[model samples]
Target: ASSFVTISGTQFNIDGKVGYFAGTNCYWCSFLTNHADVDSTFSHISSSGLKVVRVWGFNDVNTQPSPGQIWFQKLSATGSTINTGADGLQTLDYVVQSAEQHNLKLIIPFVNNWSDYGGINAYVNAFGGNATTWYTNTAAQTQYRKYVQAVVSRYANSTAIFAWELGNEPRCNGCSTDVIVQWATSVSQYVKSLDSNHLVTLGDEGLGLSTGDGAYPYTYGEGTDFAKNVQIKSLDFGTFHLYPDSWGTNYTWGNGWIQTHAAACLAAGKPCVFEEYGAQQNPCTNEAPWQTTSLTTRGMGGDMFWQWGDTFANGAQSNSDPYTVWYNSSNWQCLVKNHVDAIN
Candidate 1:
């Protein structure tokens, strides 16, 4: 029998057991056209004992893709249209089917806050105005709802889906905290109405919760509040990301970040996943402590590193980002295999 991931107080439950896990992000998985590449990548991940994966579900484009081009949705001045053909969601279908075969669960984010892979700006470009406008604009909101419904309903019954994320690191810079909280509440509630079997998360970067820390990530500059957002009734759990290099903090700062979020999830009575975290420099030395902190933290359910890498049917994936953890590498053994062994 297929069983879906569900929430117990501050914990994940699957098949009548506490479901703590280790996972990784592969945002580019859905865009792969080579079915064998998808299969090989997932095989490596499952072999490493990673139980969950986060991938990008939205790939918006203003211009129509040529034949055999990959594009999930087309946004225009009039409205949006979802592509279900071979160059469209059928590519994602292979990913879903492969994940199931490997017995790995997926956490799919519906849109990106950044410009990568045609994100919120694409909707704004089609409709009008800035990121803030996308949140409140009638046309943008309507189209987003349509896209959400299409993806959520498509795999509502699939046990391989672990959660639905509202957006990748959604934020409204310089806006009040109410902006994101209101938007997350509305969108998360809408997602729940469409698919009740799976879980939902804000997919925020865990910003705006700390006041006296005098640091960037702890400020509301990104217009997100971890404590407030986690309390949303429809959000099944809380998600936070870490990048000390990007946030102007030292690697040592992340332990408190993990602990504080854990405390917030405990206060809200929900599980919290350290969903995305990585250090480009000295990854093994710097990241292992954070993984240990996550495992020991009372309210933390799991952690997924920023990205996973593998040499698949196509070729060895590029390490241009330096965050890509190639399978069976030294870093992989230390950060993934060993970490997962500890979790199990």
Candidate 2:
């Protein structure tokens, strides 16, 4: 268990090469799939410095459902149609054993309807929908690319996943622009033929000017990268989803969606990773709420927030065990206390 690689800055190598992802968004501990507070919320989100983290496979690839709404279940149902060769279960090994014991790095999105063939209730619940054959369906896009090749064969040789989003916020109008360029060139070529060592993306909730596959931002593209976005194509880098103020879109994560995705990811050359945005303290805002984590570590291209304790009161999914507030380390360094880092 030792191999965490990086460097993916995409748009099919818009040049950058992949390593700018700062990070957040533990999805209130869902990636841990509730693995007992998912290893202490990945030990307080990798001590807030974050190498990477964006987990979500259920209910949040961008929640809006109601068209045909097909959420098929399997961990228990009819009892294996019997593909049973070995594919992926164990709630992704509680996020690869809590991000390899907190060294951390994970982005795992895998579906959303923001555009590029995503709608018709996320394309018949991603292929296992109309029961196969819209050009040969493969159980929600080829058994979700064989569950990303069985979660990249148990951690792509170990670094604990740094890329592989494939879909989230996709929506390219009524679906089928070659099914978003053939599902991002067939799962980034089958996740580089079984984790050729990590890297692959396509989240897109911005780059959005509006492509309209069915409307609701399928591939926007005012033109910066992604050749002009349709949920941008191919893979290797470039993903988006920000919420400086919240998804209702008043836009205020720290004002202007963190300086408009940190000035289009440091003026678009590449390397920007926000499979989602931040904000957990809407507890009615009596003061503490800077979007914390130091303006989410000073803006764009690296952050996963928009979660990490979605509910179950302040115990925050129970890490502190009976009462939380970051388990009272002075009620959590009195809320950010000048962007941490002194380490007493």
Candidate 3:
């Protein structure tokens, strides 16, 4: 705790000052073991004055993307038991080591809600789809806990790790809020038990707010209550994402989403962040005001763009899409770097 970064209200303190970061996600970071690419990309990120990098720390073994592309699950081979070698958890070890060398911190999600890489639903299926039991089923929960314990134990001493997230965007579908809250509380508490040095947060999309009325996420209809979800005692901070273009709203309204959640967090006396936000421009270049507003007016603790380059170009979820920033260096680097300097 003394050596690692710690959160104080709406600010992050490394050794002093309210630490804030300008960052982007690289979900495929662990797989890029050839370091040359990661090294280059992170160099660009650091040069842009960005201080943090977020990446997927969990990928189910059954997910479609194969061996060298994504890594983290214990099982790297088909039908194999927990393995952490070449295409397994060791990939993350490499990622952590690499991050430290680059002077960047990491926010790692332990699982995903979507099928992009065999997420929580995969675990449910692994235990027979009964989501109600996802929080209690010993069989499934044990594996989940084992994964958390393993990762936290591995990085217990590293300052490069910013936090351990519950899942990418946890939603219970038909399960009750009670079930989801219990799950978050249990898992996050379990993580704290293992790694007392770092922070723990739920990777929620901040569903269930009224905007001007004011306060929410798509998971709302599915029983995910934004205030209730974050208010849990186990969670250390608040986080949410914004995609006005993707949400079918204009950019300002999307920015309003930032205000809504930031208000909730401020009211709760906790630090909060726009964990991911972006608009796809030819270069996704209109991000500076978004960055500035979130910091000055919204009181957000940090701003992390949706991504860097997880795919070469135009991949459906690629950072190259509307969210592309550094990918278009001429238009983006200065914009992002300027904001980073303005805030830092």
Candidate 4:
């Protein structure tokens, strides 16, 4: 019999027990070419008792060497098909096979909102950079759907994949909330039809749509309707990222934000993951307090940090962010480890 991971109410279970994990962001995992590099990272994460990982799954070829980094094109520039062999989905396949070997599950986001990857912008470019029709345009929608089917169908039975996310913090594409809801619902339902064994979610930063809805108004500028989005039947869970420094708010709001997202899941009778969160601090002081807030939140399912160490450390925020270094401080590392230990 195959052991498939499933969600019950607001918790995840595999092999018959609740699955709570401490995970990290390694967005570049699929870009790695060396077998040793792939093997050692998963080995370390497993040894550290971390069970989940979030990574980038889509790359449009148009933006080669995006900004400060080397270019990786996982797809054709037209967004029509997957690039095969060495420089394409093969590396991601290796990551999946290696992750399973190391006993870690994966969370994959299909696209990026920022220019870091081709993301929605790339999809729009496929139809001449018209954001108006990117969601509704037949050609653009078909291309995106093709990519989704190609990915979901291939991994339908793989136990290493934890969930498939819609996009990394998708916001403000000149699309309305209704359009987003329709798109998310259609995409998710389509994935389920192809692969019923795994879960699907929207990779939204929890920004509420309603005006004057208390703290949720923080999302006013973000172009997403968190409450309306998660209500989709096909989207199995809720997810959000927190960046207090960017939001110009304090950590207290971070705690409150987690609660609201979790509450959304509870209202829908599904699970919610604080999928991405980090703040720079000496001793990484917020580790315990953040975990404590999630712990107390009624329907909070799990906590995954925004990032861990990047050996490349290419002068990106991933390199200098205090929370990104796994070995930065002995006390901080211990706190993170102990938190994972206690949860598991």
Candidate 5:
């Protein structure tokens, strides 16, 4: 009895029903040392009715970690190696297994555009180049493909996977749009060749749209064109993040942002997910209306907030980001529970 999420026209379908959902991000789940903590976090997410979770699938390092150190791959000057021992990919295996037990689907990105957890820079460190070189370098791209093949082949048949992402917030600053577009095309097609069961998305922040706002996000400053990227035949859905404060915009600006992406997705004949959005101040008050706009949008398939917080088996997780929404708090009651109620 295997169950997997599939797409129909411009929406997500699961078990033959509309798969519109409200989910959350928890990038640290696979990094936890205690298996109990992983189980507890997934339990909380399931109880909250969040059917989807996006987590980091890659933890690259320059050198082989010592015993008990967490890393998924060790990149060398020549090539990269996948870590399969107890402290390596076994952690990710537990995350996938737990999500299955809790009946939550996962959206796992292969790498990070940022430096956190040894992202693209780690590859650059190993192969000797900058961000632009990452997309063009033969050795870097080859090693990256090897890594993608390893992770995708591991869980290709698992029903818990919702989609495979290219990279988290992938951007090539000061570059043209074609750079990312070509990379996404090549990588997405590669992922599809490996596993056809799950969907694939470029985990970008939905930048580079000609929304007439003249802001950085609407401009080509970030080297992403949401309109062009979403139309990639291999990309199953479009993803966008909203952070007005960070973008030097106001809360109300997000409404039009959501609408514009929704329209683009509809035009491209694919579902669009409000993948990541947050407002550090007055989170519930500011985010509630954005939730409303996403829910009402016709081609919008789902929405996941910036992150999820909960009391683990060990203790309460630290709130490093003001955007984190803890389980069962007032924020959860309004943003998660109420929004899920509406989504249902």
Candidate 6:
């Protein structure tokens, strides 16, 4: 209840009582976090006895004069610079306020790999993949500090902010652990320096290591193992994502780590939350129907589903991305709803 607190590696509390959290991930459209069914989404979630929601740290730079802004690699197809004004972020505030009003806790992400997965190009400003130069560039660093400060300061009083997430799937090919450690250390240091009222964390893929022959290059234990290890003491909670097919190999994921990569997080003595662990509705990867059961059976608390909305089909780009086995029919919502409801 201190508003914000650090767990040193990945320690966090639930209502002053240590416990695991159950939650869901929602995104109606690529740039749109909440869609028309937002109220219904929250209603359904709360009605279904869920506790938390992971809202995105919008990565696309919607710097366009036109509407229906298309995301082309983390930036607007028309423009690549972030607006930082009402247009780029005000809409985001709506999602945040909505969550607060609806009795849902939110986990907002600030960085991610340069995928722009929704086909949106918002990473034009991100350094390397999506570094954003905050740590390297002094001016940019100050600006980054202000951004987190402003965002967190505003939401500091809101009980709905369950945790703070930094970066989503930052990959490394034999990258230095110290770099990963620094990444977490710097962001944690900067953000917590501003808002210590909420819990803090970094979003890596799963704790599972990978060969990364494709899109999801960042494995779970890449840089994080050392960061959590070297830091010794840090902020609240641990975060990891799940995308098994990244190795371009098929493997069954059951009630345990498909790769045991999370063991490092556990060894670091942090209460781990595999934040983004749901399978894609694709074929090359795990399918929701069979996949969810196995993963949930191993559920530490509860893992978030990959997505909830968007008119995207399982194999939207067949040859290029022949991942999902089934195309999302109009009844996809019902399918997912039943799947989650059944899991709980």
Clashes of each: 0, 44, 12, 1, 0, 33
- Candidate 3 structure quality by residue, lDDT tens digits, 190-240: 888888888888988787665443322544565576777778888888888
Models sorted by lDDT, best on top: 5, 1, 4, 3, 6, 2
Task: Give the Cα lDDT of each candidate.
Answer: 0.88, 0.47, 0.71, 0.72, 0.90, 0.49
Residues 1-344 of candidate 5: C-alpha lDDT, one tens digit per residue = 34888998778876466668888999988888788988888988888888899999999999887788899999899757899888989999999999888888899999999999899999999998898768888888999999999899999999999999999999989888899999999999999999989999999999988864877789988788999999999999999999999999999899999999999999999999999999989999999999999999988999999989877755767444788998889999999999989987
In terms of lDDT, model 1 sits at 0.88
Error of 5 at 106 (Å): 0.4
TM-score of 3: 0.87
Q: TM-scores across all candidates?
A: 0.97, 0.28, 0.87, 0.88, 0.97, 0.68
Tens-digit per-residue lDDT, 198-233, candidate 2: 777767656442222222222333212233332333
Superposition TM-score, candidate 2 onto the true structure:
0.28
Worst 10 residues of 1 by lDDT: 312-321
C-alpha RMSD of candidate 5: 1.3
Candidate 4 per-residue C-alpha lDDT over 1-344 given as tens digits, one digit per residue, 9 for 90 to 100: 22667786578875456756577788877777676777776776777777788888877755444343433343334545566546667788888899888888899887777766687777666566465456677776777778777667767799988898888887764356677778788888888888888889999887763422365345445557887888898888888788776767776667777777777778878878888888776435665677778866877878788776644333332233545745334743655677777786
lDDT of 1 at 91: 91
In model 6, which runs have C-alpha deviations exceeding 4 angstroms?
A: 1-18, 28-36, 60-86, 115-140, 206-232, 253-262, 280-299, 310-344
Which regions of candidate 3 fall more than 4 Å away from where they truly are?
A: 63-70, 74-80, 130-133, 210-219, 282-286, 310-320
Q: Please estimate how well model 2 matches the true structure, expressed as its whole-model Cα lDDT.
A: 0.47
In angstroms, how far off is 323's CA in candidate 2?
Answer: 27
